[PDB]
Design an enzyme around this catalytic site. Sequence first.
Site, mmCIF file in Angstrom:
data_model
loop_
_atom_site.group_PDB
_atom_site.id
_atom_site.type_symbol
_atom_site.label_atom_id
_atom_site.label_comp_id
_atom_site.label_asym_id
_atom_site.label_seq_id
_atom_site.Cartn_x
_atom_site.Cartn_y
_atom_site.Cartn_z
ATOM 1 N N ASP A 131 0.830 -1.220 0.000
ATOM 2 C CA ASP A 131 0.000 0.000 0.000
ATOM 3 C C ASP A 131 0.851 1.250 0.000
ATOM 4 O O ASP A 131 1.324 1.710 1.064
ATOM 5 C CB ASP A 131 -0.863 -0.098 1.258
ATOM 6 C CG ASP A 131 -1.876 1.005 1.299
ATOM 7 O OD1 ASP A 131 -1.802 1.910 0.439
ATOM 8 O OD2 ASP A 131 -2.773 0.935 2.160
ATOM 9 N N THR A 132 1.017 1.878 -1.159
ATOM 10 C CA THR A 132 1.854 3.073 -1.252
ATOM 11 C C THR A 132 1.207 4.294 -0.569
ATOM 12 O O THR A 132 1.943 5.255 -0.292
ATOM 13 C CB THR A 132 2.186 3.425 -2.704
ATOM 14 O OG1 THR A 132 0.958 3.607 -3.424
ATOM 15 C CG2 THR A 132 2.956 2.300 -3.429
ATOM 16 N N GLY A 133 -0.080 4.245 -0.264
ATOM 17 C CA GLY A 133 -0.703 5.313 0.500
ATOM 18 C C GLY A 133 -0.637 5.171 2.007
ATOM 19 O O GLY A 133 -1.164 6.039 2.706
HETATM 20 C C1 LIG Z 1 -12.630 1.594 -2.238
HETATM 21 O O1 LIG Z 1 -11.638 2.559 -2.496
HETATM 22 C C2 LIG Z 1 -10.983 2.894 -1.358
HETATM 23 C C3 LIG Z 1 -11.346 2.383 -0.116
HETATM 24 C C4 LIG Z 1 -10.564 2.705 0.982
HETATM 25 C C5 LIG Z 1 -9.509 3.604 0.806
HETATM 26 S S1 LIG Z 1 -8.507 3.953 2.212
HETATM 27 O O2 LIG Z 1 -8.030 5.336 2.033
HETATM 28 O O3 LIG Z 1 -9.201 3.615 3.419
HETATM 29 N N1 LIG Z 1 -7.152 2.975 2.163
HETATM 30 C C6 LIG Z 1 -7.471 1.577 2.022
HETATM 31 C C7 LIG Z 1 -6.640 0.696 2.970
HETATM 32 C C8 LIG Z 1 -6.923 1.030 4.444
HETATM 33 C C9 LIG Z 1 -6.921 -0.770 2.686
HETATM 34 C C10 LIG Z 1 -6.030 3.439 1.349
HETATM 35 C C11 LIG Z 1 -4.805 3.724 2.197
HETATM 36 O O4 LIG Z 1 -3.625 3.802 1.407
HETATM 37 C C12 LIG Z 1 -4.930 4.899 3.179
HETATM 38 C C13 LIG Z 1 -4.870 6.264 2.469
HETATM 39 C C14 LIG Z 1 -5.039 7.343 3.551
HETATM 40 C C15 LIG Z 1 -3.937 8.124 3.845
HETATM 41 C C16 LIG Z 1 -3.998 9.046 4.881
HETATM 42 C C17 LIG Z 1 -5.159 9.188 5.632
HETATM 43 C C18 LIG Z 1 -6.283 8.447 5.279
HETATM 44 C C19 LIG Z 1 -6.218 7.518 4.258
HETATM 45 N N2 LIG Z 1 -3.847 4.850 4.159
HETATM 46 C C20 LIG Z 1 -4.008 4.655 5.469
HETATM 47 O O5 LIG Z 1 -5.096 4.338 6.000
HETATM 48 O O6 LIG Z 1 -2.828 4.765 6.115
HETATM 49 C C21 LIG Z 1 -2.809 4.566 7.537
HETATM 50 C C22 LIG Z 1 -1.712 3.540 7.853
HETATM 51 O O7 LIG Z 1 -0.465 4.229 7.828
HETATM 52 C C23 LIG Z 1 -0.721 5.628 8.055
HETATM 53 O O8 LIG Z 1 -0.349 6.311 6.854
HETATM 54 C C24 LIG Z 1 -1.371 7.204 6.434
HETATM 55 O O9 LIG Z 1 -0.908 8.549 6.488
HETATM 56 C C25 LIG Z 1 -1.021 8.996 7.860
HETATM 57 C C26 LIG Z 1 -2.355 8.367 8.289
HETATM 58 C C27 LIG Z 1 -2.504 7.102 7.423
HETATM 59 C C28 LIG Z 1 -2.219 5.827 8.205
HETATM 60 C C29 LIG Z 1 -9.197 4.185 -0.427
HETATM 61 C C30 LIG Z 1 -9.989 3.858 -1.524
#
Ligand SMILES: COc1ccc(S(=O)(=O)N(CC(C)C)C[C@@H](O)[C@H](Cc2ccccc2)NC(=O)O[C@H]2CO[C@H]3O[C@@H]4OCC[C@@H]4[C@H]32)cc1
Lengths: 99, 99
Positions: free
Chosen positions: A25-27
């Site tokens: 997960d690059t996000g």
């Molecule tokens: C159906 O389509 C979707 C459904 C869900 C999502 S999501 O945003 O919930 N997510 C899905 C994943 C949980 C399976 C994508 C992620 O890449 C999110 C993307 C995201 C980024 C930031 C904030 C909210 C979401 N990242 C995230 O939740 O990161 C957490 C874990 O590490 C920390 O890094 C991040 O940066 C600091 C906080 C978060 C923390 C996107 C499109």
Amino acid sequence: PQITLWKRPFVTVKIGGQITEALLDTGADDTIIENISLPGRWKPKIIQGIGGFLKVRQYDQIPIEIEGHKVIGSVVVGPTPVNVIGRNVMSQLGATLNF
Amino acid sequence: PQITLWKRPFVTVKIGGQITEALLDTGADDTIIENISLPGRWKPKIIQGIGGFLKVRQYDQIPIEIEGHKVIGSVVVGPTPVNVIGRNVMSQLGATLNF
Ligand SMILES: COc1ccc(S(=O)(=O)N(CC(C)C)C[C@@H](O)[C@H](Cc2ccccc2)NC(=O)O[C@H]2CO[C@H]3O[C@@H]4OCC[C@@H]4[C@H]32)cc1
Ligand SMILES: [Cl-]
Ligand SMILES: [Cl-]
């Protein structure tokens, strides 16, 4: 590997000796795993996501094995709809996004 | 491009003619943007991530331009801490994760 993205990029990983599956997960800054138990002290992290925040355990200095690569990283343990391998692990692999 | 992952992989994108910044996110199925306004009909949707679900709006057939590539995709508009470009766009670019 070279992993395409027309389906979810799941990989098998070993974390603290426990084999589980997780999404590359690059996000995600951090690596978040629900279905493992780790021993020892941990630091409360309020972790943030799309739905809000939650109180979880951050474990440090955990051995992580992924596609033959062996790295040490921090692992967050708590509820997540899917386990994710974040950039704190992928950057140690030299992983890149290419298009 | 070849994008490394030791920092967040932000890119500039144009969505429905609106320039914004968004994270390339292999753990996102969908593209979720907060700071844009799109015209016309949409579908209610609920997505789930860390911390729970959130309710959002789905617009279809939106022109998306990213690094010179022009694709049509669905865009979800609603609150998200960071705008994310999901696999529904990245797979149309033939993007891969490499390590
Ligand atoms: C159906 O389509 C979707 C459904 C869900 C999502 S999501 O945003 O919930 N997510 C899905 C994943 C949980 C399976 C994508 C992620 O890449 C999110 C993307 C995201 C980024 C930031 C904030 C909210 C979401 N990242 C995230 O939740 O990161 C957490 C874990 O590490 C920390 O890094 C991040 O940066 C600091 C906080 C978060 C923390 C996107 C499109
Ligand atoms: Cl780490
Ligand atoms: Cl789409």
